[PDB]
Symmetry: C3
Subunit: 314 residues, 3 copies
């Protein structure tokens, strides 16, 4: 199968300068070369160039609406295109906000896709619920059909079309949920596994459920939109919103491994890596290194080891 790395150097989704530098940091780390060594064909589509909308006045609270709307629009166009060509897309972020268009394009080619959202936050705040204008906790709100019209249309997102509903998504590792955001997910009965559920059940049982829940009936394309703020800071320290008591480098690798083993991996988002927020070159190397680790995992690097077929090492 083919792999399409797509650059997403964006940051307007939030107030902390840095996330744009993400893809550059991941690539430098040897992301593209390492992948090749896998059983997949890899093509690096490069980084998209986002046109900065001048005088992007705030829509009430929401910040840089037009900038974000446009950037995403462009992305959904590219994702949609490669998905069309039947290649598995891999979106290197900026900030999560770009999850909007990375799923949009995908649903376009695969309308019956399910979504496994790895984050510590729901990011389902609507333009009426955000405490900050950061589109960085609103991605899911623009994607849900259930939340359609449940808030004013925003400058620049006129193009988005709620592609998935609450019966297709599954959060994993929630540990910082705002009131409004807890309300919504309880209201729309959205399937999740906050850190407590993980604790209780175990990464293993949790992955077993998310799977029978999102695939029990129909086997469909899976979209893994991973927030690096998903794991604990001790592994992914260079992020905008580090929340203590998160997913272990193991638990998380487990995840990307099982999902590899489903063979249904279609789209993948590596978001919120921020090479500048590193308190020491070490925390930035650490952060990056595991990010690359998850990715290679999603594409078959097993911890039990790997060997090329048909080769007699004896």
């Amino acid at each position: 199968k083919p792999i399409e790395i797509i650059g997403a150097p964006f940051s307007k989704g939030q107030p902390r300068g840095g996330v744009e530098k993400g893809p550059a940091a991941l690539r430098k780390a040897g992301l593209v070369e390492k992948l090749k060594e896998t059983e997949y064909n890899v093509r690096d589509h490069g980084d998209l160039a986002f046109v900065d909308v001048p005088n992007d006045s705030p829509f009430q609270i929401v910040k840089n609406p037009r900038s974000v709307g446009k950037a995403n629009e462009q992305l959904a166009a590219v994702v949609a295109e490669t998905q069309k060509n039947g290649t598995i897309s891999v979106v290197l972020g900026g900030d999560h906000s770009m999850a909007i268009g990375s799923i949009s394009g995908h649903a376009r080619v695969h309308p019956d896709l399910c979504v496994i959202w790895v984050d510590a936050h729901t990011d389902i705040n609507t333009p009426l619920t955000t405490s900050s204008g950061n589109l960085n906790g609103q991605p899911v709100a623009f994607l849900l059909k259930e939340l359609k019209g449940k808030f004013p249309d925003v400058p620049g997102f006129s193009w988005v079309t709620p592609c998935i509903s609450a019966k297709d998504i599954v959060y994993i590792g929630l540990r910082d949920v705002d009131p409004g955001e807890h309300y919504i997910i309880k209201t729309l009965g959205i399937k999740y596994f906050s850190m407590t559920e993980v604790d209780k059940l175990g990464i293993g049982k949790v992955m077993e459920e998310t799977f029978s829940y999102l695939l029990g009936r129909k086997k469909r394309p899976i979209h893994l939109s991973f927030d690096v703020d998903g794991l604990d800071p001790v592994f992914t320290p260079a992020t905008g919103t580090p929340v203590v008591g998160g997913l272990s480098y193991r638990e998380g690798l487990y995840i990307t491994e099982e999902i590899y083993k489903t063979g249904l991996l279609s789209g993948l988002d590596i978001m919120e890596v921020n090479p500048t927020l590193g308190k020491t070159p070490e925390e930035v190397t650490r952060t990056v290194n595991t990010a690359v680790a998850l990715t290679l995992s999603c594409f078959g690097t097993k911890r039990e080891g790997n060997h090329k077929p048909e080769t007699d090492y004896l």
Copy 2:
């Protein structure tokens, strides 16, 4: 329901100066204000003032017997009083030694209470078994009916009355148990879950058992007497007796969460926080911060998030 924060600036229970400063540190951290924001009414009864008994000569080995006996006596009086008024008590420690009177008063109003003891040590050394005169590993011995007369009466505790028996308590996170102390618990068949049991079972299954075991038949009031030396030092580093390989900030939060969900939370002890034993302002902030975290958990702060009822955030 009402909440009564009760100050317990005591330290004679052990040889390391510092634990008295605990409550001041926790409050500074915003313990009382944060609680209010919960669905409970909160009243800060302040810190008790412990009268120092002059010439408190050692009872054989046991140190500062009178000082401790008196301090506890006073506490059991206050706890007993608020419990009477039907409010859920929350004892901010010093050292664990004050667990004696914090449960005493409680049993007085609720004679059929069960106890979930979170610590890394049993603290069930009797005046004949302690290697050190520290009443800080003897709290349970003064509370157990089974251990009645199994040791000489001590100067100042004449007042205590073994309120609970071995069939009502459950340890969680034992990792440093002295010979005498392992003997006793094996002798009186005391239900526990040392780190190994947690490992084997899982925080989840463990909380499921402790619950069917202590509540299967009769639903009763629960007294959560939490030692901060319960979790691993990497989370609660500022303590008198740090033992490696302990309860994760998650596992522990899981606990305080399930117990919240039983609705049977009556008395709560936050003991052995010691702001002075911090190797760096960081370890003291860390220690404190989680202590406050457990507490707010016990009172409903879920990791899956929270929202006030009847409010349409839409």
Copy 3:
């Protein structure tokens, strides 16, 4: 039962100077004295003195073949001898390479022994498969009957005799497996539990399987050859090959505990501790301390606590 501590100050098995100093560091830490306090008799046989073969030219790739071969030869002689005297051997390493002769001697007295290999690496690279000439990933290849003649004989190991086969060994904590090494283990159907299996199953279930698998039918002597690179660096940081996402100080202690509880503990290897690779005296103290911790565990120190029999602490 008797315990024989055997010194193995060796390092030629790899390119990083330091592992020889291991035993000195462990002993300094109070390894021998602490053991005595256990229910076993302890004798410290001292450290062996390894004769340095001059002009030990490389066998193709393999480095210092003769040096390693000879050192091991000597060890297998001593191990074989004490095992004969029916005492449980405990080999303090250098590098793992010495696992070769520490098992050799053992099989000599106990030909039907099983092996639980705790490491993060398989160390089953054959002289044809190693990327480096480091006999430090080849121990298992010289021990397996299945790999007999599957590579050229090496200068100095003429003496070794494949004592165990693939149906007697069980790896635990694999997280860095080379191609050739993954091939072999898949080819010879070698039972393992890479970090993922641990994640999935749980230390508990994993120890339950390894046991029904290696002892279900015949109860036999167990040889625990522990690599300190088995646990995560956060606990055992002073090692040649630290791999992220490993065995927790708990999971590992669990292990040495269950194996204690089988009563079948015969030989034990504490390898790759390297006091010099410590970035801070702390990481070296940490590393050592847990190493000693595992060992005392293997010999009965329970986390639930311990008490001498027949003694009334009351």
